[PDB]
């Protein structure tokens, strides 16, 4: 149930995170760690959320995949 498929298809994914979010930098995207952990941090950086906001709207899209 709980398993990290970002990271796998991050460069790839990296196109429909900036789609579902728009503010979210693509650049910054296509970086290094891509696994949700940094999905996290990025929406910390950009936005400024709780982590669990961050969780749940990383998780939604994992729903999507």
């Known amino acids: ?3 990290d498929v970002i990271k796998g ?25 891509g696994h949700a952990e940094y999905l996290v941090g990025k929406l910390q950086e950009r936005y400024g959320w709780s982590k669990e906001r961050a969780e749940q709207e990383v998780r939604d899209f994992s729903d999507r995949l």
């Open 9 to 33: 298809k991050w460069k790839q994914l990296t196109g429909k995170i900036k789609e579902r979010w728009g503010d979210l930098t693509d650049d910054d995207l296509q970086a290094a760690d």
């Open 1 to 3: 149930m709980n398993s």
